[PDB]
Amino acid sequence: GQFISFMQEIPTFLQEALNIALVAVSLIAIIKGVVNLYKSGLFQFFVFLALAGRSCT
Amino acid sequence: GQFISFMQEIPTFLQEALNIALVAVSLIAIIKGVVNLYKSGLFQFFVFLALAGRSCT
Amino acid sequence: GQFISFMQEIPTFLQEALNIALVAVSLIAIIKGVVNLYKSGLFQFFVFLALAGRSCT
Amino acid sequence: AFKIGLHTEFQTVSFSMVGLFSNNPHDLPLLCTLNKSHLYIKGGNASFKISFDDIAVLLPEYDVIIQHPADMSWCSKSDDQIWLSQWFMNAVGHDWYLDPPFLCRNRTKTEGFIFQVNTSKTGINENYAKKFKTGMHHLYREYPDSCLDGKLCLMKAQPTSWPLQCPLDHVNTLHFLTRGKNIQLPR
Amino acid sequence: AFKIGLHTEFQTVSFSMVGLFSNNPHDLPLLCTLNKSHLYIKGGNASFKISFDDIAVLLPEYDVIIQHPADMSWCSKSDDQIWLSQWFMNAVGHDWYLDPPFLCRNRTKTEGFIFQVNTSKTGINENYAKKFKTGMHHLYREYPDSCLDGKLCLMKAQPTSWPLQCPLDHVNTLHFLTRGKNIQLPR
Amino acid sequence: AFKIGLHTEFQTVSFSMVGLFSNNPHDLPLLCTLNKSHLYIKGGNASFKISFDDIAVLLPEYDVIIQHPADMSWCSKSDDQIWLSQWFMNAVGHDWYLDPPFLCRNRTKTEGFIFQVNTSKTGINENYAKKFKTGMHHLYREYPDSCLDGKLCLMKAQPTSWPLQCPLDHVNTLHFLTRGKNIQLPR
Amino acid sequence: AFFSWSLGYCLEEWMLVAAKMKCFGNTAVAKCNLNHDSEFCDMLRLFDYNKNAIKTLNDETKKQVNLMGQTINALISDNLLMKNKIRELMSVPYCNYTKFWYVNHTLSGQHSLPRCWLIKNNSYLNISDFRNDWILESDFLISEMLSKEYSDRQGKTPLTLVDICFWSTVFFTASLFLHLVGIPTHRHIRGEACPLPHRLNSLGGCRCGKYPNLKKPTVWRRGH
Amino acid sequence: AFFSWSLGYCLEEWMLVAAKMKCFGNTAVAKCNLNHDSEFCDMLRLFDYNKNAIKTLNDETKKQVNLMGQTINALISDNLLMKNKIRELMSVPYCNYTKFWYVNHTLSGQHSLPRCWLIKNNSYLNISDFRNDWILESDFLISEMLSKEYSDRQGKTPLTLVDICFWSTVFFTASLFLHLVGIPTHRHIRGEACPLPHRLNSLGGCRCGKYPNLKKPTVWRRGH
Amino acid sequence: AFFSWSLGYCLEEWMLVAAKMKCFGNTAVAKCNLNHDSEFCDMLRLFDYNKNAIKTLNDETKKQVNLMGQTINALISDNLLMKNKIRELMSVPYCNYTKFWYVNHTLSGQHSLPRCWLIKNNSYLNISDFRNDWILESDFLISEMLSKEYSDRQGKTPLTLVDICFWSTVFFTASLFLHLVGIPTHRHIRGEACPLPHRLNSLGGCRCGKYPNLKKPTVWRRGH
Ligand SMILES: *[C@@H]1O[C@H](CO)[C@@H](O[C@@H]2O[C@H](CO)[C@@H](O[C@@H]3O[C@H](CO)[C@@H](O)[C@H](O)[C@@H]3O)[C@H](O)[C@H]2NC(C)=O)[C@H](O)[C@H]1NC(C)=O
Ligand SMILES: *[C@@H]1O[C@H](CO)[C@@H](O[C@@H]2O[C@H](CO)[C@@H](O[C@@H]3O[C@H](CO)[C@@H](O)[C@H](O)[C@@H]3O)[C@H](O)[C@H]2NC(C)=O)[C@H](O)[C@H]1NC(C)=O
Ligand SMILES: *[C@@H]1O[C@H](CO)[C@@H](O[C@@H]2O[C@H](CO)[C@@H](O[C@@H]3O[C@H](CO)[C@@H](O)[C@H](O)[C@@H]3O)[C@H](O)[C@H]2NC(C)=O)[C@H](O)[C@H]1NC(C)=O
Ligand SMILES: *[C@@H]1O[C@H](CO)[C@@H](O[C@@H]2O[C@H](CO)[C@@H](O[C@@H]3O[C@H](CO)[C@@H](O)[C@H](O)[C@@H]3O)[C@H](O)[C@H]2NC(C)=O)[C@H](O)[C@H]1NC(C)=O
Ligand SMILES: *[C@@H]1O[C@H](CO)[C@@H](O[C@@H]2O[C@H](CO)[C@@H](O[C@@H]3O[C@H](CO)[C@@H](O)[C@H](O)[C@@H]3O)[C@H](O)[C@H]2NC(C)=O)[C@H](O)[C@H]1NC(C)=O
Ligand SMILES: *[C@@H]1O[C@H](CO)[C@@H](O[C@@H]2O[C@H](CO)[C@@H](O[C@@H]3O[C@H](CO)[C@@H](O)[C@H](O)[C@@H]3O)[C@H](O)[C@H]2NC(C)=O)[C@H](O)[C@H]1NC(C)=O
Ligand SMILES: *C(=O)CCCCCCCCCCCCC
Ligand SMILES: *C(=O)CCCCCCCCCCCCC
Ligand SMILES: *C(=O)CCCCCCCCCCCCC
Ligand SMILES: *[C@@H]1O[C@H](CO)[C@@H](O)[C@H](O)[C@H]1NC(C)=O
Ligand SMILES: *[C@@H]1O[C@H](CO)[C@@H](O)[C@H](O)[C@H]1NC(C)=O
Ligand SMILES: *[C@@H]1O[C@H](CO)[C@@H](O)[C@H](O)[C@H]1NC(C)=O
Ligand SMILES: *[C@@H]1O[C@H](CO)[C@@H](O)[C@H](O)[C@H]1NC(C)=O
Ligand SMILES: *[C@@H]1O[C@H](CO)[C@@H](O)[C@H](O)[C@H]1NC(C)=O
Ligand SMILES: *[C@@H]1O[C@H](CO)[C@@H](O)[C@H](O)[C@H]1NC(C)=O
Ligand SMILES: *[C@@H]1O[C@H](CO)[C@@H](O)[C@H](O)[C@H]1NC(C)=O
Ligand SMILES: *[C@@H]1O[C@H](CO)[C@@H](O)[C@H](O)[C@H]1NC(C)=O
Ligand SMILES: *[C@@H]1O[C@H](CO)[C@@H](O)[C@H](O)[C@H]1NC(C)=O
Ligand SMILES: *[C@@H]1O[C@H](CO)[C@@H](O)[C@H](O)[C@H]1NC(C)=O
Ligand SMILES: *[C@@H]1O[C@H](CO)[C@@H](O)[C@H](O)[C@H]1NC(C)=O
Ligand SMILES: *[C@@H]1O[C@H](CO)[C@@H](O)[C@H](O)[C@H]1NC(C)=O
Ligand SMILES: *[C@@H]1O[C@H](CO)[C@@H](O)[C@H](O)[C@H]1NC(C)=O
Ligand SMILES: *[C@@H]1O[C@H](CO)[C@@H](O)[C@H](O)[C@H]1NC(C)=O
Ligand SMILES: *[C@@H]1O[C@H](CO)[C@@H](O)[C@H](O)[C@H]1NC(C)=O
């Protein structure tokens, strides 16, 4: 719930070097976690089990 | 020392979502650290040096 | 800036087990990060692009 | 009230006065100053008016020289006026056994009610003048302080109808209660 | 004292009273109220008993009308009784120069010692009655407040032996010390 | 001031006294004690010296027995001495209507100015002696407390030149201002 | 009871000039449970005593409610009011217990404690001689709000738990790296295949005689 | 000295009705080094003055220990006792400085400051009209204990150290991932082997003439 | 105004015995904006009133600055001075408002609030009977400095941000490990090659008939 208030208050504490550093590291961590998981193959197994049996190729 | 008092007080702050989340992540981190280290092979080198020379196989 | 004051005050809070543990983990993390990055190969690509074209070998 | 900063606002709150005064379990004596000269003190049913000037309407030779509250019964026919006068003089500080007395009229005289005190800043009664100045300063917020150091200065208090425009302040009432010792408020 | 919550307990601590009183470097005057009527004040060696009723045992015409502590020497032969009476009247508030006096007996009379004050809530002595009511309320925790507003009410104080069952409270002693100014406790 | 610990230092700050006293908007009465006996009180222009001993220089039969500040005008020709004496006695606590009076000289007599009070710890004036002892203790930091409980003890105050070596302390001045009520400091 | 609340409190309509029910924040009101230098809270105590007075009066009791100088002296702070009158004597700003202002954070409803609007020469003080106060007041309000929101979660979780989580995380990272870099398992003969299971001994041979003890060079690897 | 301790203090046997030596916690006792609205601490100050009195008396000194109204007025809080008597006048709960209660945490020995058990009509107050207090008292006790235990370690470690540890950890994780994903080192010819050490140049050839500059396609890999 | 500052304040030359301008720290001076038991701050208030007195006098005003017992009583704390005189009566240490000492941290300029150097028998107290105080004073000074430096950054960053960073970091580590250990993708026939793209179905075959449905054993691997 306080996340929405954080978005509302974003242009108040954004004038701090540590704040931008923390938000940047959080964003890069989230995005590379997503890309790394896509490199892992869980959704690859999802499409594998979806394709299992229905199609030869 | 305060760890024992923590075990004594466990069913007092256990009624908090963040508390159960933190204890769960700590436990899963510990267990997968142990299993990952067993996958590494330090104890494999232990049994290697134990078996070194005494047995051909 | 406060880092210099930290170096000045080092032999004041150094008499704490948690303090030495934290400084040791920080130092080992920094050094193995450096060695791991050297194992990665970014500077290897630096020397690769430096050697590119000028020398056959 | 206006926006200050980026999400904050500046606004003020003002407390009522007539409700607090009309709502107290007892009846409080209230002091007031209207225009820049006219001082007023209202007790239970005595709405006394106080002024300062160098006009001597009373003389020690032919008057009553009140020294004790017991003699005050010889001045007015109503007990409320006696109570108000005695307690006002007690609040300003007039311990009746070591100070000059003050002058009033015999009640049977056909000239109403009035009491007056001389506070001229001269050789004699200089200490009394300074004490009365301090009491007036403490019992009235913005004291005009008439009758500056000079020839003569006499204060007079007379009974008049209570004007319906006095700002019912409460700081002066608090100081009157604090300075006055063992003051008993009726009702 | 019982378990509250899951690891916490609720328990109380009570402070002793006889040790604090018997342990003070000086001797403290203690006030007490026994049953629902009998008031008691014990000083150094004066164990005075106070009651209220509309019985007039003393009269102004044939008595000593004490106005000053100097005249109090004409009532009792022991200085402790004089000290206790004077300081009790000072504590309740009886500034001796602006108030009605109080009546006592000549010492050579063969009828013991007693002092009495009239506090009937009538036209005269109404202000004194209210002041004494406030003093009694401040100097006694649960004041019975006998002799309600009516015909007459006189308080009497007489010397009796100190009963060995009074709850030795200390709030009343603190109020007696606070109200009484420049009270000198012996020993 | 020296090094304590590993990076911390211990050092002290002392406040000046002559600047604060010479810098006050008014003139403050200052009390002092020199050597181990000589007590001094300096007001506006009265540099009074106080001593204690069992020497009776004044007698009730042939003197002025001052009971009220009004009679004090019959002792000295300068108003500052009268002000200082009256306010010092008021500060130590001498409410003039319930206490024994104190003795002084007629002004026309050719023997200077002096006032004296007897405080011998005997049967009569024992309460006054204890009250004066408490006042002296409160108005002087390290009271020598001469004339111990015995035959006689009389305090004398006389006018002498102000010595230029008294430690201008300020705790005693604060206590003098606190004990003295409605004291008016000139200039 | 009287104003010693332990945690909101609203000011009724008849108490305010605007004649509207205005609830003040409980946290802000609870600030002066020990403050003796807040004229706003002195007025609050006076009004609470008055409220108890109407409660008694309409309850039709016999309470001997004496009103005298000592009662009001005990209610309000004598020292503060005397200091205010002192500041009135010399011509410096003061306030006659009637006007109060505060900085309001309109998004979360949190507000600062209302100070006193100082006066001078029978007039109020405008923004020209007063701007230096509300800026730092608002900054401190934001800082206090952030600190309180942090302490709310702070005072409900154990330090041992977070310390355990931190140490478990650092061990997790260390072991992850240990897996990642890889540590050689056994020795292969240079130029040959994996000797497992009949693996060479310390001096490069076997005690059973199948592998000659030639002290052949070995290289440590992970796989076969 | 008197009760201005800077950090436990126990109540002797003769002071308590149970007549047993009861040590109160030092942290709880130190709470009222500035509080003026705690009857328990007023009684504590009175008893400390009495204790110093026996010390002087049995030391056989000549101290002029005057006992008068002003002394006791200076010892206890006049305002608090006057407020208590005021609350006594109108029929509302008060306490006559004799009974105090507290919430005790029996595992660590930490206890709350003993409040005053209010009285009314010559009787004590039972749990029916009093249950709303001790619940929040115990909750605040637990919160205060947790906050104090946190602040104990908090006020002995530097913020710069933990910041350095956090940044070192995040860099460690980033570099670990950089090792893990792998970054291609050099270019191999599509369909051929590794050209190293005689490796092809930008336009797919060599300046020495061994490898023709045919602009052959290349793929970036790590290994050989 | 008077001493109610809301945040440094220096002591002028004529006020100090050393006759040198000595700036005290603003944070330390601001400590006693509510303390009533600090003789140093009582002297500070007295000197501030005197300073305002010279300001008025050299401004040539008509202010009726009455100096009486009540004014000084309102300025200094009557209770504290009365307690000091009480402690003077019985022979126990006290201080006559003239000498103060503090512990100074010379590297950052932070200093403790100056206490009062107690006296006895017309003499000061030396280190033999006083060493137990300044050690804990310095320890508390260091602890307070560390706590203040921490709280400075503490009250300027949001808890939600750091919580988001922590959860993002733990997810980052978890996914990094998930990449590292490796999870098998598809099934290869035991003893054969990779069937992709014409991959075997659940029962080990194909619906198009190219791969017979023989229920051949399969092993899950990542690569081809
Ligand atoms: C209220 O107090 C003032 C104080 O000034 C009284 O006025 C003063 O009255 C006395 C009467 O004896 C005057 O003394 C005489 O004055 C002249 C010289 O000034 C001369 O006849 C004598 O040598 C003697 O000193 C005094 O001067 C006079 N004050 C002034 C400034 O003229 C006033 O009468 C008092 N009011 C009442 C109603 O009692
Ligand atoms: C203590 O004070 C009471 C106050 O009531 C005294 O009783 C009062 O005594 C006076 C004596 O003059 C009575 O005044 C006279 O009463 C009647 C009418 O009531 C009549 O003879 C006269 O017109 C005059 O007013 C007064 O009434 C009486 N009070 C009551 C309520 O009867 C009492 O005597 C005092 N006690 C002592 C021991 O002095
Ligand atoms: C200041 O007070 C002291 C208090 O002692 C006065 O001395 C006392 O003077 C009275 C005068 O009547 C003495 O009383 C008589 O004394 C003897 C027996 O002691 C005898 O003649 C009588 O029976 C009567 O009691 C009293 O004793 C005496 N005190 C002492 C200790 O001797 C002193 O005179 C006062 N000073 C001034 C200047 O007034
Ligand atoms: C001292 O406190 C009093 C209240 O006890 C303040 O009085 C206020 O004075 C202002 C003028 O400065 C009044 O405003 C005027 O009020 C009426 C409203 O019908 C009307 O004459 C004007 O339109 C104007 O608004 C204000 O009402 C009044 N407040 C109260 C509650 O009575 C006074 O300002 C304070 N003293 C100083 C020196 O500021
Ligand atoms: C005011 O404080 C006093 C103490 O100063 C409290 O007195 C206490 O009163 C209770 C009864 O409510 C006493 O309990 C009884 O005590 C004796 C013990 O032998 C006996 O009569 C009964 O068995 C019963 O336990 C209690 O002892 C007493 N406490 C003290 C220390 O004397 C009083 O309760 C307070 N006032 C009110 C209105 O509660
Ligand atoms: C009470 O406070 C006073 C100040 O109001 C303290 O007086 C101080 O006393 C010492 C001696 O103990 C003085 O030191 C001496 O001062 C002069 C300097 O020329 C000289 O005689 C000696 O060389 C020595 O340094 C000190 O100056 C003085 N301070 C002031 C500000 O006057 C006094 O110590 C305090 N009371 C007690 C019992 O300590
Ligand atoms: C109020 O709005 C609730 C705030 C909850 C914040 C949770 C943050 C979760 C971070 C997202 C991680 C996503 C990983 C795939
Ligand atoms: C008091 O009991 C001491 C508490 C110490 C807690 C240490 C926690 C250590 C975490 C275990 C890591 C194990 C890694 C293999
Ligand atoms: C004042 O001196 C500034 C203090 C800034 C400290 C920054 C710490 C950075 C840690 C080094 C990481 C290096 C990674 C290669
Ligand atoms: C007093 O004020 C009233 C109200 O404004 C005004 O009508 C009247 O003239 C004033 N009187 C004097 C004497 O100033
Ligand atoms: C007028 O009142 C005074 C004041 O007591 C009194 O002395 C005088 O006798 C009264 N006059 C008459 C005619 O009664
Ligand atoms: C007073 O109380 C005592 C003790 O209980 C009792 O014996 C006696 O009868 C009581 N007296 C009255 C008059 O109530
Ligand atoms: C009785 O005492 C009184 C009180 O002073 C006194 O006036 C009276 O003379 C005494 N009686 C005798 C017979 O001495
Ligand atoms: C008083 O002190 C001064 C200054 O030291 C000294 O000269 C003088 O002799 C002393 N007098 C007495 C009586 O002790
Ligand atoms: C001396 O002064 C006294 C004190 O009032 C006075 O009574 C007396 O008459 C004066 N002497 C002369 C001779 O005037
Ligand atoms: C702050 O302003 C908001 C605006 O909606 C209002 O609701 C709130 O009550 C104000 N806070 C106060 C008065 O404390
Ligand atoms: C006060 O205000 C009045 C007008 O209301 C003005 O004439 C006067 O000069 C002002 N005084 C001061 C000291 O500012
Ligand atoms: C205060 O200053 C502002 C500046 O804009 C001005 O508008 C306003 O009138 C001033 N107030 C007073 C009372 O002078
Ligand atoms: C709380 O209860 C425990 C039970 O063992 C006791 O030891 C401890 O003293 C109590 N705490 C107090 C009285 O502060
Ligand atoms: C007080 O208690 C008594 C019994 O002790 C009872 O009769 C009376 O009604 C009670 N009064 C109130 C006001 O509760
Ligand atoms: C308080 O309420 C409880 C409820 O169980 C009851 O047992 C107890 O007697 C009550 N106490 C009083 C004094 O009425
Ligand atoms: C502490 O000592 C240093 C030494 O350089 C000094 O500059 C500083 O002012 C001192 N701190 C104080 C007096 O608060
Ligand atoms: C006080 O000091 C003096 C010397 O200045 C000495 O003679 C005396 O014994 C000391 N007294 C005490 C009680 O220490
Ligand atoms: C205090 O003790 C120290 C110990 O070294 C000593 O040098 C010093 O003289 C003592 N001070 C006093 C006043 O006795």
Author numbering:
A (entry chain F), B (entry chain K), C (entry chain A): 2 to 58
D (entry chain L), E (entry chain B), F (entry chain G): 61 to 247
G (entry chain M), H (entry chain C), I (entry chain H): 252 to 258, 269 to 485
Manuscript text:
New World mammarenaviruses (NWMs) are enveloped zoonotic agents that can cause human hemorrhagic fevers; they include Machupo (MACV), Guanarito (GTOV), Sabia (SABV), Chapare (CHAV), and Junin (JUNV) viruses. That precursor is processed by the human peptidases SPase and subtilase SK1/S1P into three polypeptides: a stable signal peptide (SSP), a receptor-binding domain (GP1), and a membrane-associated domain (GP2)6,7. Three copies of each non-covalently associate as part of a mature, 3-fold symmetric homotrimeric membrane integral glycoprotein complex (GPC) that alone decorates the surface of the NWM envelope.
That map showed sufficiently resolved density for the J199Fab to allow for the identification of its epitope and paratope; it revealed an interaction mediated in part by the insertion of Tyr105 into the GP1 cleft. While the functional consequences of this effect are not fully understood, this induced restructuring may play a role in the selective and potent inhibition of JUNV by huJ199, as demonstrated by its ability to protect against infection with lethal isolates Romero and Espindola in a cynomolgus monkey model of Argentine hemorrhagic fever (AHF)30 and its greater potency compared to blockade of hTfR1-mediated JUNV internalization alone.
